[model samples]
Target: SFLHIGDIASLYAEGSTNGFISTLGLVDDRAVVQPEAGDLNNPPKKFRDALFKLAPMNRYSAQKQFWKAADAVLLNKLHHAADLEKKQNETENRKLLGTVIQYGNVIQLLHLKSNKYLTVNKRLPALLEKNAMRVTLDEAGNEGSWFYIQPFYKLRSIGDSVVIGDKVVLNPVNAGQPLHASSHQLVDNPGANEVNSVNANTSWKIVLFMKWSDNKDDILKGGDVVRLFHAEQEKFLTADEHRKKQHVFLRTTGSATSATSSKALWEVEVVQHDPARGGAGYWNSLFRFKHLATGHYLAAEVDVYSLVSVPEGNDISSIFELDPTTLRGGDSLVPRNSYVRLRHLATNTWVHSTNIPIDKEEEKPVMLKIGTSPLKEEAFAIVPVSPAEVRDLDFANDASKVLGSIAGKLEKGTITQNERRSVTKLLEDLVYFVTKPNRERQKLMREQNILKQIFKLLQHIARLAYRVLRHSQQDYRKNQEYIAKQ
Candidate 1:
């Protein structure tokens, strides 16, 4: 299938052709004695040896694959040449055999872990204790591991858009695992023993199991929570017979009670919706769910309320399609929940959205100054709502921002050391839930926000590790004499 011939030394040289003088012409030209074949310590051979020493690769077998010598290549030549000019570094020559050795392992590890990277999954005690766990592939083609931990928020979905209560969007740009993924593993370890690994084929499934958080009758008062997934069109499936399926697990508020009041866990089975299977599509009704299980007074159902449109000035109630290009970013577009909140502005008012076109000059300024390149068909929908809707609705984008702003204002208050500790604990608990596992309603918390915070935290921790190492060295030296005396 392949052929290996000659020393291939020219492979390491750049733009090198037969134009260069042959190795034989250099002897009299430079007054240098070229080593003859089979000479133990020939001058040319010594020079070659010196050059090879400089490049660890020269010592390696030319027949070996570059992957095998990646580390040596990096240390010997790759690092220097990577930043230097390719021509000056003779990078072209190394391109032939040095590629496999360049950042090989680093790249391999990154490729393997990329799908899971930046992913956050929460496992609720209710679901885990009862064994109702679930995993599915998201839009980015990455699989997610999730279980209902707690219902702390509500989301609205209209058409293909999603919203979290009135605060944030479920899908924000630059927020998620960068690449596609497959497979999921679940675990239940009371003694760190029961390891249940559920592997699926082309489709994802929800396992029926649960754990209760308390022995008390109910943990979740009332309100229906559902698991939602988008279906690949018929054309995407491999076989026509292998159609998608729609599944729902309805747990009414008074459905189940825990035997133990304190140890009762309230996890639910995964509720599945597949559009291809004649179920809910990506629209407001698709997410319309009511939780009747809880008898609590605050128990209620939530739905998607609005589509981001221009402000309704006159004759509202018009719906306009937004040119995808007008979208500056995921954040620029408001979710359906915003429209619902608009209802509160004025009681029982039907607000309409209208799209308006922009002139070339207006569009060009945005393009030049802000880099917002809108599409030709793009326009904004102006939504009209009562003053009440505007009043009740918070302009903040998401829950994290809400909590962060609230926490920031409170943090400045004068408090005793004991009070400070208590406040810090409370803040930690709040952040933990925001970033917890098994949270199905990944509402307003933007993916980019989570990642940026996490990255900063990791960098801080890394610096702390170096500090610890230095401290450990100091401690070791201080105790050396004492240990010796002992």
Candidate 2:
């Protein structure tokens, strides 16, 4: 029902989409809080200092910063930029899990790898919002630090618990003023600022990220299977390992892109949390996509973090959360996308051209329609061919049957008068074709590829070895001359 003394949650700012409050060293004298948010890296801390009371005596002159020079590409996404740290902080994040976050609770978050605390003060001015003072981190003050929660939403009462996803204002209690911590959208600087009651700038939501255990009733976690139907591309997000490990950029399906449709399906593992009671919820938030067919974890690079896949399954790019559009997330979780005109409805039937008929002989026309389904076929007509095309088609179609008849007469060792006339008519047509200019004759072959048949007919006619059924050759000649003289 409320945040606790130790909660493994991310502080997401309302001003930025998916942005979290994390320290980015100093912009000038004040530490910069990123416009792009999280929180997976920034787990709440109140009692750890009592445990870390000896840390100062053991502290080195200067501690190392975990961010690399190459890490600048991931600056826009701070919550996930420190995902490797998330993998190590099981006890670090879950330390205060059982404690409840009530009003007037003085708390600060500890960044696991960096060892920084969430702090604010009026002495340091804001980078963007002038009145909104700067918020930073420190190991200063004997009394570690203090932050007061001024719950908005349904929990304004002092002892009422602040549940995850419930928006509220944060006060840097040690700052000793009415200023609540906030973020400025106008600034390129990712610095946190202390400002007045504009909830858009001041309000923050506690999204449960990692869990030590799942002893609570209201809390939940993930391992759901979902198809990530890419919005504008109209393709399901896909993964592969062609040559040991090759391209995964080939997004999937509608025949699911490949012959295998199951490749388009993905098994969702919660990047934000682990398995616990009550299973799934809208707040189950971000995810690590496991490709069912290819068996790789899905992640995007777009630039620094390649939109890619990893077999190891621990990369920051592999994790992403959803932001709802027109539909508000309620009890159930729905992973969905946007709508453009077309090239968008790519998974539907509008682009299909494979409409088959009940009887191909009837040659019926079919209409194509689009539906919400993931697969379809399209059938469309093309422009008709030239006048020579019809004649060529007709000639080519009849050529085989015509040539076979000539061969049949020869096989019987006799040629009937009607068969001779038919063969003569076909020869006349072939001669007519050969007499044409080179351009037209080539075109005759071009439309139907029937020149071989024409030449074959000529060879068959030349080789016609026939024996006269009534008379020998010499007697037949004498008989023919006698009839002519009579």
Candidate 3:
């Protein structure tokens, strides 16, 4: 099958410097693909001047040349490249694959039904349909397009590093310690700084289900399902759907276990990456994993071991990270995808899926253990979604929380002067979010009267503060005159 009608393929051509197809750009209202300088991984810039050229090339000529080179390559590598094109096209059309976003990452979120991108216009972020989607991949800089594979805390394992007690510092001594699911002790090092040290005890990994190969180098593609594997306990993290509270738990089914369960399957949706705070690169990117079965995000409470699914986006409690060291797995450990660790960003605790006795029965709950070091049990395999199920799963749901979070800032008296512009900018998004043509949009607006009240109060506060400052300045001048007379 040719996959979809808009399928574009990257074919490697012999004697081509770009290694694929080249001179790719839009010319004369059509896609111009030149065989020269064509890279299978990246296309060439279209509208650029050649230093050696005396006159700008005609658009028609560029278009014609692209087709000529594309046709020649197709003929030469028909057998080898044809099927690859079809399969890749099928993957692209069927799945939305990308990286995760952080506070400062540049990313564009896609609104699936409308086929529009969530874009910013005049500092206001909203959805708009456009022909070309613009994005950038960087650590932290501008607004760019990117995606993410989020990892969630699911289980505790052997040699798992965790935190417990007050004034916790990730213990340097506990590095490479064996994991124990029930342990709640935090690492202690009065003389050491947790930020500078490398503790394996507190580390975890997220391994994809697919094997690593030349073709599948570290990119997270569509149709991928991942696992939160704990190495210390030698168990795979699972959501305990059968438990009383439905906690995310870890289960041991022997090494190299590949069991398909709703509890074990997680969909890593690609959202926008922003570069404002810095970047959510694989090193510092935050991930938000949604449970496939529950249609909820995997979230946790502060300093609590409870793991539950909630219909919220980008809550600090729900955000997680894979240990940087474990994510760059050792060359010898590549085949064993379970050599990773998971850390909950908000709690500063390690994630674990442990079995504890409750009354007469055993209950498995995903627990957060605090530690200064990484343990083996905290390691997990980041599995990709399998072929047997749906590729397009919905993760973003239940808005108004976006508004609620801002409202929270207003109520808590946490709005800073520096963040005043941010609040005003967010007001625009709240209107857009609550006004958009969705089932909950109207309902959200109805329930958001508090938002209106908060906005008005903020304006009033700004004016009152300005008046107070003016009076203070007047008093200061009077006092200065009295001092001069004295």
Candidate 4:
């Protein structure tokens, strides 16, 4: 059911009143859904007053029993559904409903319900493999990456369908397996398990979901804290840090309902080739996923293969190639965007959402998670974080002008040995200076570059003095050796 303003929705987990998702309602005319632990049996009067009936889809008796209290409710505002649809109708008003599906002019069919793309497995024979079509996660360098489309309707028509430019079409080979892509002329025969066949299945009805759009013109923009959701598994892609290891992994989480849940949130930044170009290389732009929790870039491990968030120093693996054709839109990336494949520079392996399937018998005992492959399950939808709860890190701009003057004096060679020693002592003090300082000292260390230079110069002076002292001490050892030889 659609959410609307003033409409209350009670959310619950596993058909129980033990853990209820609550919202503050009509309290000083403020309404916001805050899911927390609460009693499902005993709901407050104010909550009940603002309570809304369950929608037809969620009206099941078992489901209705859990949402009896205001604990698990989501209050929908008025004009929400109409406003949302209206906004999505035009390019200017195209807004993400919070979910993204892979769809566009490219012929690779993406199942809306499953969030997987149509693919021809390379393990099969020529004609059989060509016809054999299955839906899997996103693989970067694969045939599924290439597909073309042309609509059957001039404007819009019933049984709306599009003819695929490629020869691949879906047809079932057996009752056991899914429909695979097969070669066919303009048209082919329709059979039993051939449900998604490109010939008989050529005609299809498009169902628009609340969080996704099919318009190739729609763009998913950048500069947002977004959640990348795995289409089939219903999990949010997470980059988690390990206690023992320096790196982390691209894992999945159940659900994210709180702003404090940084594991599920990421800052999406568009890495343009040349900012001076002003959108010249926009299409070929790279993207980075910065973890909101740690302020680190999402990186893939080279020595120990896994996904991790690297700090400011290392960012090579952080940059990723965002496949625009999946969402197929304008300049920006957004939530409910499309099948984005994240391939790290260090390792060519695509950052996948799930581990490869294994049998329990063959599964040896393991501590950390295993690896992944290219499939639709790996495809991610970048969900934007709400602007309300973002905390930006601002660097202090205070630079030390005194340090510049000292550097100039040292360069001029006007100072005596005593003066040099005094200046050296001062430089040492600056190197050890902390954010808090004494009233008498110049806070030269506040400048990062100045502190580095002071230490470098100090090291050079110490090395030269140590070398001369070593030469003077060598005469005693040489005299003893000469006496022994005589």
lDDT, each prediction = 0.20, 0.41, 0.34, 0.36
Q: Residue-wise lDDT of candidate 2 within 1-486, one digit each (tens)? A: 445554455555564433454432221123333443323343322101111110111111111122332355446454353454444344453554566666656555554223455445556555556455555455432122355666765536667776767776666554554334444443424334433222244566666544324323332234333444434344443454444563444332332222223444455555434321122334335545566545576554432123446664556646654333345535544322222111111122122112222123433422111222224211111111222433333344344346555665566677878567666565455444434133334333323323334334444444321111112122344433432342
Q: Least lDDT summed over 10 consecutive residues: which range in candidate 4?
A: 25-34
Q: For candidate 4, lDDT tens digit of each residue in 311-415?
A: 751355677776543544454433344556566645656765435322224544112343433433355655555433332110111123333444567677665
Write one digit per residue (lDDT tens) for candidate 1, span 342-371.
121212222222222122345321110001
Off by over 4 Å in 2: 15-19, 25-97, 139-144, 153-155, 178-201, 212-486
Q: In every candidate, how many clashes are there? A: 61, 28, 88, 40
lDDT by residue (158-179, candidate 3, tens digit) is: 2233111111111111121211
State the displacement of the C-alpha of residue 135, model 2, in Å, after optimal TM-score superposition.
1.4
Query: Which candidate gets the maximum TM-score versus the true structure?
Result: 2
Q: What CA root-mean-square deviation does each model show from the true structure? A: 30.3, 32.3, 24.7, 29.6
The reply for model 3, stretches above 4 Å from the true place, is 1-217, 221-223, 243-245, 252-254, 269-281, 302-304, 326-338, 353-377, 386-486
Reference-based lDDT, residue 124, model 3: 23
The ten-residue window of minimal lDDT in model 2 covers 47-56
Look at candidate 3 and tell me the lDDT of residue 215: 15
Error of 1 at 281 (Å): 6.6
Count steric clashes of candidate 3. Answer: 88
Report the C-alpha displacement of residue 81, candidate 2, in angstroms.
37
Off by over 4 Å in 4: 1-219, 244-247, 250-260, 273-283, 324-336, 354-377, 391-486
